[PDB]
Every structure is written in structure tokens, then in C-alpha cells.
Design an enzyme around this catalytic site. Structure first.
Site, mmCIF file in Angstrom:
data_model
loop_
_atom_site.group_PDB
_atom_site.id
_atom_site.type_symbol
_atom_site.label_atom_id
_atom_site.label_comp_id
_atom_site.label_asym_id
_atom_site.label_seq_id
_atom_site.Cartn_x
_atom_site.Cartn_y
_atom_site.Cartn_z
ATOM 1 N N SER A 1 -6.299 5.557 9.542
ATOM 2 C CA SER A 1 -4.914 5.987 9.371
ATOM 3 C C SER A 1 -4.755 7.077 8.323
ATOM 4 O O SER A 1 -3.791 7.846 8.384
ATOM 5 C CB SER A 1 -4.012 4.805 8.991
ATOM 6 N N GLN B 1 -7.527 -2.873 9.505
ATOM 7 C CA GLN B 1 -8.725 -2.053 9.639
ATOM 8 C C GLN B 1 -9.732 -2.459 8.573
ATOM 9 O O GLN B 1 -9.366 -2.818 7.451
ATOM 10 C CB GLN B 1 -8.364 -0.580 9.512
ATOM 11 N N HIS C 1 0.835 -1.197 0.000
ATOM 12 C CA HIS C 1 0.000 0.000 0.000
ATOM 13 C C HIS C 1 0.871 1.249 0.000
ATOM 14 O O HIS C 1 2.063 1.212 0.313
ATOM 15 C CB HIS C 1 -1.006 -0.018 1.172
ATOM 16 N N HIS D 1 -5.420 5.287 1.479
ATOM 17 C CA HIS D 1 -4.550 4.237 0.945
ATOM 18 C C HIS D 1 -4.788 3.997 -0.544
ATOM 19 O O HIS D 1 -5.925 4.061 -1.026
ATOM 20 C CB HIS D 1 -4.799 2.897 1.646
ATOM 21 N N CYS E 1 3.570 5.396 5.591
ATOM 22 C CA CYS E 1 3.700 4.184 6.382
ATOM 23 C C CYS E 1 5.158 3.747 6.411
ATOM 24 O O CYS E 1 5.893 3.998 5.461
ATOM 25 C CB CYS E 1 2.828 3.081 5.784
HETATM 26 O O1 LIG Z 1 0.699 -5.535 9.082
HETATM 27 C C1 LIG Z 1 2.035 -5.676 8.628
HETATM 28 C C2 LIG Z 1 2.758 -4.355 8.603
HETATM 29 C C3 LIG Z 1 2.146 -3.202 9.059
HETATM 30 C C4 LIG Z 1 2.818 -1.992 9.036
HETATM 31 C C5 LIG Z 1 4.113 -1.927 8.559
HETATM 32 C C6 LIG Z 1 4.757 -3.064 8.081
HETATM 33 C C7 LIG Z 1 6.148 -3.006 7.576
HETATM 34 C C8 LIG Z 1 6.663 -3.951 6.711
HETATM 35 N N1 LIG Z 1 7.913 -3.921 6.247
HETATM 36 C C9 LIG Z 1 8.654 -2.903 6.660
HETATM 37 N N2 LIG Z 1 8.286 -1.931 7.480
HETATM 38 C C10 LIG Z 1 7.025 -1.993 7.920
HETATM 39 C C11 LIG Z 1 4.062 -4.275 8.123
#
Ligand SMILES: OCc1cccc(-c2cncnc2)c1
Ligand SMILES: OCc1cccc(-c2cncnc2)c1
EC number: 5.2.1.8
Length: 147
Positions: free
Chosen positions: A138, A115, A43, A141, A97
Site C-alpha cells: 500500500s 499485509q 497508522h 506506514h 488511508c
Molecule cells: O482493517 C481495519 C481497517 C482498515 C482500513 C480502514 C479502516 C478504517 C477505520 N476507521 C475508519 N475508517 C477506516 C479500518
């Protein structure tokens, strides 16, 4: 008639029929093609001032409005659909994110983990398909189903 969540619509500017999915907010000209325990998605998230946590690795204090965040999402969708930019490239540069560091990849997940609007869009996408703007607590997306 059509797969889960699709309906017919008419373009206001050309009068051509198109198809819209009210779960994923995807839209396309072609008639949609043809549920698993788990899906894998990436995402691109754009947060706004009403996000649950209005902060990110890009910005300590996220101040853009929801409407401004939707405009950014819409622009990213246009460049992905034109091929001017790749989804992974935009996610790495602009997703609010932490998953931006992994080109937006969240890995695989089941129902009940994410969510609800994100989960419903993820599972209604076919493999390889991209959502339109999906709204959660959040932010906004763009979701790409990869498995
Ligand atoms: O729900 C799984 C999730 C949620 C939020 C961030 C990640 C993620 C993944 N890879 C690297 N950094 C952050 C994974
Ligand atoms: O923080 C780095 C990282 C890497 C990989 C996964 C996550 C994560 C986050 N939230 C829920 N589940 C998994 C976070």
C-alpha cells in the site's frame, strides 16, 4: 539477549551505541525493555506512485515517488519524536488511508488479516511503541500499537 528483532548498532555521527529493530524499523538510544492473540494499532500511511492503488481521499492521482514518500514519513517521525506534533494529529491530516478520519485507528486484529510486513511490525511492537517506516504494497506506514 534482547527482545524479538533487536540488535546493537553504532551511531555514525556520535559513536554512541543504539538499538535497532529490523522488524519494526524502530531505533532508540536506550536498551529495549524486557505473544498476544490480538493487537490494536493506528497508522499513518503515505502512498506513492507504485502503491497498489495510487489514490486516496487526499489525492485522486498520487504521483509522488517512493523516495519522496519516505522523506515525508521520516519528517513525520521526527516531529512525533520531538513532541512538536502528535501522531494522531499528523494521521488525521496526512494519512492516505481512510482511517485518517479516526486518527489512524484500525481497531484490533489477529495474525493473518493484514499485509505481512504490517502484521509483523504490529505484533513486534510493545504496547505504546511506534514503528519506523514499514513498507507494504500500500505504501509506507508509521504504526502505533495502542493495545
Ligand atoms: O482493517 C481495519 C481497517 C482498515 C482500513 C480502514 C479502516 C478504517 C477505520 N476507521 C475508519 N475508517 C477506516 C479500518
Ligand atoms: O470504510 C469505512 C470503514 C470503517 C471501519 C472499518 C473499515 C474496514 C476496512 N477494511 C477492512 N476492515 C474494515 C472501513
Amino acid at each position: 539477549k534482547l527482545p524479538p528483532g533487536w540488535e546493537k548498532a553504532m551511531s555514525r555521527s556520535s559513536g554512541r551505541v543504539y538499538y535497532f529493530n529490523h522488524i519494526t524499523n524502530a531505533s532508540q538510544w536506550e536498551r529495549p525493555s524486557g505473544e498476544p492473540a490480538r493487537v490494536r494499532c493506528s497508522h499513518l500511511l503515505v502512498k506513492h506512485s507504485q502503491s497498489r492503488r495510487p489514490s486516496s481521499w487526499r489525492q485522486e492521482k498520487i504521483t509522488r515517488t517512493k523516495e519522496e514518500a519516505l522523506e515525508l514519513i521520516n519528517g513525520y517521525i521526527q516531529k512525533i519524536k520531538s513532541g512538536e506534533e502528535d501522531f494522531e494529529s499528523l494521521a488525521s491530516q496526512f494519512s492516505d488511508c481512510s482511517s485518517a478520519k479516526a486518527r489512524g485507528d484500525l481497531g484490533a486484529f489477529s495474525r493473518g488479516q493484514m499485509q505481512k510486513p504490517f502484521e509483523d511490525a504490529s505484533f513486534a511492537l510493545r504496547t505504546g511503541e511506534m514503528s519506523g517506516p514499514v513498507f507494504t504494497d500500500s505504501g509506507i506506514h508509521i504504526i502505533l500499537r495502542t493495545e
